[PDB]
Homo-oligomer: 173 residues x 8
């Protein structure tokens, strides 16, 4: 099937067509993979504005969005609030426990879930979902495992690319 990032397989489009929940890793997926730290204890992360638009589009097109994080951080809470993401698990790590809880609370089967990751810690959940996605510049060992590898790098619009894929697959782009 034709996409604005290049051809995708029929299998990936079919997986995309059925997604009701999009789970997004933060570091290296929503961000550039960096953490900015300062001498007064400041901590910043950089998110991508066009990803934000994609997320808002998904949320208004009957695709739930969730984030699972290993450490509570106000900046992540603030980003979720800005975007309307209400499913945020923090201080977890481990992703399976939150994944299982999320699926129970939403009554959504794993085949109807997509997950976008950049590192090996993402694989246990990615292995279980309907559409697993590695970002273009993910850890090299993750890349061949995923159903779809984005064209765009983490923090640069990989998430927008996935939102665009789901919306296209579902006739909502």
């Amino acid at each position: 099937l034709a996409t604005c990032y290049g051809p995708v397989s029929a299998d990936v489009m079919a997986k995309a067509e059925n997604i009701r929940l999009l789970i997004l890793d933060v570091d290296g997926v929503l961000s550039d993979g960096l953490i900015y730290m300062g001498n007064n204890g400041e901590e910043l992360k950089a998110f991508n504005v066009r990803d934000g638009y994609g997320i808002r589009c998904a949320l208004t097109s009957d695709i739930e969005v969730a984030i699972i994080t290993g450490r509570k951080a106000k900046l992540v809470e603030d980003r979720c609030a800005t975007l309307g993401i209400t499913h945020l698990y923090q201080g977890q790590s481990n992703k399976l426990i939150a994944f299982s809880d999320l699926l129970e609370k939403l009554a959504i089967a794993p085949e109807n879930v997509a997950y976008v990751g950049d590192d090996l810690i993402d694989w246990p959940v990615m292995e279980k979902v309907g559409l697993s996605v590695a970002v273009a510049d993910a850890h090299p060992l993750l890349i061949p495992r995923a159903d779809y590898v984005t064209r765009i790098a983490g923090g640069r619009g990989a998430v927008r690319e996935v939102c665009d894929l789901l919306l296209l697959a579902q006739g909502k782009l």
Copy 2:
């Protein structure tokens, strides 16, 4: 016509020659597309210094500059103040409402307006203006719609490239 970024078409040069108002998107055009967020509620964006010089040159060469934004932010107000941009619409529901108001207030026809964007939300106004510009690394669906696609990426000097184009077209470079 010859430019320091490579050839442009006669049609683009002719459009550029007539521009009295340059409207600039912020995120992904003036910036690198990122938003830096911190755990104390800090918010930063990165602007490009050579873009600033271009904007000052435009403003002193009888080309008005305006910005239309979806959310009031002191950092954008400050950037405008530094550069001498006085036409700033913030917290805007869309872009057409501010566009229409701007054109009435300035008594300038749409053909004498340029707009530089990076995403689909920019297209409704871009469709109406004399010179529409997509930055080099804009969303892929926007790129083919624009009159001119910059060589330089958002936040890296795309805006300077557009200012340089207008000034060259108008014999002011």
Copy 3:
């Protein structure tokens, strides 16, 4: 407006939808612009098989194909024979002459013609047609003049990309059949 090479404009797709004749330059469009010459007067030129597949798809999908080239070589006649191309004009640098001949011979309006070029010599014809195309690595002064600039370079599948575009625009891409020769 998605294509397998990237997005195209609505305007380019609409122009492509109307094409009944695809005219190609040879050197720099069907080849990468090289002319091979030997000490015994031998000459070679290299063509790309995936362009051959595109040309066969076009020819079998109601899109005629013609060639207008400034050089003259029997090898080009042979290439046309392989591909079933029956409209070849060689030794012609004033390409408007051949263009006028084709409009008459094929009873076709210029808006229903596409032309793929790489150098300034191609512009007089490109200016007149419904869909003008510059290959990705065309002369820098030709590039901004064309309706569509290919993603793929001359000799490397620019012609295939144009064939794919016409077929897609005309709803013929999925069912098109060619030989990659």
Copy 4:
């Protein structure tokens, strides 16, 4: 799973482990897709010596090699002779015919076959085999269909990369011997 070209999936490695016959397209796979033509009817094609080394390694490591190509040229018979390839089908664009012939002649199940292609004409056979491979610079519509996309371009060592993959999967890479010819 580590290779000298980058990680591959467990699925691709498992498919590779089972290959007893490697089928190759010629133009765009064993070459970069160019056909050289001259004024006296001469034709040349270019092959890559490191692909030759891979093919020799495969043939001496209990992996048979066959070629199915839409063009027909004596020069291809000569290249096969250099490399010891004894299964050549030329002038065939309906590649399923030659494929069926090979399955019978070599008494082999399709799951034990790999096919390396670059254009849509290759897909009907690729669809049926155990390991389908598109070269790095294959037609964009073929790329997403294949089990494995090579890192290296057609004519530049894509075939060598596939030979190396099969040998690695089968525990034969370290001890394989070839000639880089």
Copy 5:
């Protein structure tokens, strides 16, 4: 030997197999080589999250990690605390003085040490260790001196690449 970043020499793999202590330069190795400075005296540096995971893996796989720095900075102390790095020398004149001290305190021979650097100041210690590593975008004069040059740039996952190499060599990846 095969690695997920490409082939490495037998000699480099053999050096990697024996590493009990990994010493990491900060600027241009753990970071992007930048220092972010503000008008209120703010100072930030950007670390890479996937590097952090590599470091944690090394530390839980019997490979000690140390950092030697030329200026005490809370942000570096905080990064070390987050990752479990306890060997941090700051405000250092040399790197050799800290290196010597570290090896005495840990009773580890230089052949069992790896060092990852990006500039000429790193060379005196790199010259002495078992596995010297220059990052991909290190100063050009350092690159040919090192046993191994990473594929990944400083701040982008060069450190993760080295951790992955050590763990692979030691059968722990």
Copy 6:
């Protein structure tokens, strides 16, 4: 002549041999061309650590270093303090006035001065000096005017490249 960044002309090496004062533009030369602005009035710029080492090497090898700036900023003052740069002209812009003053105060001829710039505003002074340098990613109209165009981009080590060139030329690298 041979350099670690590639060949340079005999003319450029000869100009470099005679440099007693190196003048550095800040934005797009010492920095990445960005200015980071926040909603509490924060302003950050990013400097390159390896450039800092080059500057210290120049200063200890009888090459004075100066900076001329268009706006007083504590972050620039702090960077200069860290590096031992004592010739800092701020709130200037033009650059000729400071240049002339600097040369009078130091009793140095223009032929013994190098200047590294990235934009057209740098050209009037660059035109007068012994060794004019445009960074790799300077404004396109500046590039052909300079005696030397660096291989490395602004904020990424262009300044270190120039320091390395001067030191090599003077037999001090």
Copy 7:
């Protein structure tokens, strides 16, 4: 000054404005540096048609063209005949000899001459002329010596780029006419 390949210096433009004779190396300048050799003593070289267009534009715009090469091959004579080049020196590695001959034959001062080279053998003549040019992919030791370094590689349109530069400098670019052969 803006050019279609990027900005050039005022000094280069002023040098270009004064050129009445353009001297070209062959291998690595008019070609990508390859020499094709066969088992029967055949030899081929490849030239670029867009360079042909530039040469035709120059020759018809009062800029003479000459070639000085270290090799000797009839095929080079044939290429000169195609393009109307009437000043060819082959088998000459001490290129100062041919250069002196040209200055006398064409009654021209060295400042009115341009030379395009790719290797150190070209430098003795380049040192003497008004505009010296190294192609983009010239030997690294030649590159810093030249007045202008082309953006385009040898054999790929470096010569065209130089022709375009001279014509632009002389106010002849828009009206120049060539054949892309």
Copy 8:
């Protein structure tokens, strides 16, 4: 340790300083690895003129040059004749045989020999010499084994880069003279 291609290690420079014999593979080192084949049994190979210049510089600067190649073709004899190479071994895939012959014929210790290769077949000889070199685009499994990896690709000036390295290491680069043929 600065070179015109980038920095080299002190160890590589010291190895280069001692070289009296430079041995070259052909396919993939002196060429980009392609073999051109025709329907009448024609064969072509392409060599690079700047490599020719380096070889002439080496030969006139007390560095002998030899070739050991797995293929056999008269065209290679002709190339050696052009360049003054008098030590050619063709049809040889067990390259240790030719290597031993050279050591005896030239009364030379292996530490005074350099070898430039591109595939695994070259490794047995490379393992024994004072300076082993893999070209930039050598097979990925060869690259980490070599003392020096060239910056320039096979057929594109990797051999010239090695010649330049030896000459620089021996204080002969400035004064070296060649022909770019």
